[PDB]
Design a protein around this ligand. Structure first.
Ligand SMILES: O=S(=O)(c1cccc2cnccc12)N1CCCN(Cc2ccccc2B(O)O)CC1
Ligand SMILES: [Cl-]
Lengths: 18, 339
């Protein structure tokens, strides 16, 4: 699912600035 | 209508006055007892502190001057403190004290015990549309206020929104907020929230904040952002494509709003058109929103964080408690003269 793809992305935690 | 113009004109006069003559040096370190580390970053820390005289709790952001200089953050750091002491709006965190010593810069802010929107969203999964709309209305008003000061915010994301004891939002981070009457060019922000024109090396303006609002609304309502991937470059490629998919539970009104906020063509993006912010405020998805009642905080919040009193820290994570060292030698004095 899209949520599963979100989890697989590894970007589920707090996101740092570039 | 004429009331709004008059309110924003008064507000800009007060802002520019404080902007031109910032407050400095309104407390010192030994006025405070340290209680707990609330957050740790590459240039400093945020700690829960108790003012010894009054017993009031505060969040104290502590920035290591040498790390700030090492990481090329001098202007952002000075800018954030200058913004915070000069702005005044219900959904913006209040700066109570600031000072510096040999080693560090200190900003002492009202303590928001409910923690980041981010944790609550990841815990619950996603917010219902009424819940998401409640937060969204506050960001819309906040952006209307900041844009009236010619400030582009550029750093919107659930990580940067705190939930107060009334359930309302407080915006905390202003390092990237730039005074921009025209255009600006810096690549900065968080990948998931970057407008395509920031990725595309074009000049950009405050319209990037309305794009980011679209990202935020999508993430609050879906539980995940519209554009994600294993690596930032692949997020950039999805963003600049005009392609986005919606969860099947998104209402029709919500999708129509998001199609107009997540509009690649910034000459067709809501907030950036002839009627400005009123295209958003008057959109069908916001039909039930009492804008004035939101601003006056007279709307029953959909969620109230759990707070077992003042100084409760249960909505923040646990961090290794490190010393606060203050060197015998003044570090970086010339660079931070204006702080
Ligand atoms: O720790 S905060 O939640 C925080 C910040 C401001 C006021 C607060 C009032 N009550 C509670 C917490 C508060 N917080 C909001 C999210 C961002 N970080 C990350 C961070 C951590 C340490 C130093 C800098 C930064 B930074 O990205 O510039 C820290 C600040
Ligand atoms: Cl995390």
């Amino acid at each position: 699912t899209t949520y599963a793809d979100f989890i697989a992305s590894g970007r589920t935690g707090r996101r740092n600035s570039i | 209508q004429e009331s709004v113009k008059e309110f924003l004109a008064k507000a800009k006069e007060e802002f520019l006055k404080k902007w031109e003559s910032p407050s400095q040096n309104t407390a010192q370190l030994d006025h405070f007892d340290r209680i707990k580390t609330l957050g740790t970053g590459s240039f400093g820390r945020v700690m829960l502190v108790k003012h010894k005289e009054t017993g009031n709790h505060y969040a104290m952001k502590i920035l290591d001057k040498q790390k700030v200089v090492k990481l090329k953050q001098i202007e952002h750091t000075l800018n954030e403190k200058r913004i915070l002491q000069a702005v005044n709006f219900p959904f913006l965190v209040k700066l109570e004290f600031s000072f510096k010593d040999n080693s560090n810069l200190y900003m002492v802010m009202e303590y928001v015990p409910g923690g980041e929107m981010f944790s609550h969203l990841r815990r619950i999964g996603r917010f219902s549309e009424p819940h998401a709309r409640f937060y969204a209305a506050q960001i819309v008003l906040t952006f209307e206020y900041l844009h009236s000061l010619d400030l582009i915010y550029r750093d919107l994301k659930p990580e940067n929104l705190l939930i107060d004891q009334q359930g309302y939002i407080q915006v905390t981070d202003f390092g990237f907020a730039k005074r921009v009457k025209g255009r600006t060019w810096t690549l900065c922000g968080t990948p998931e929230y970057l407008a395509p024109e920031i990725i595309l090396s074009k000049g950009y303006n405050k319209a990037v904040d309305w794009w980011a609002l679209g990202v935020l609304i999508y993430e609050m309502a879906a539980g995940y952002p519209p554009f994600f991937a294993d690596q930032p470059i692949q997020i950039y490629e999805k963003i600049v494509s005009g392609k986005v998919r919606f969860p099947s539970h998104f209402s029709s009104d919500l999708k129509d709003l998001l199609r107009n906020l997540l509009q690649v063509d910034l000459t067709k993006r809501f907030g950036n058109l002839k009627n400005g912010v009123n295209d958003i405020k008057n959109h069908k998805w916001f039909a039930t929103t009492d804008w004035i009642a939101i601003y006056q905080r007279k709307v029953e919040a959909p969620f109230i964080p759990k707070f077992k009193g003042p100084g409760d820290t249960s909505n923040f994570d646990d961090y290794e408690e490190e010393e606060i060292r203050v060197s015998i030698n003044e570090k970086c004095g010339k660079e931070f003269t204006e702080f």
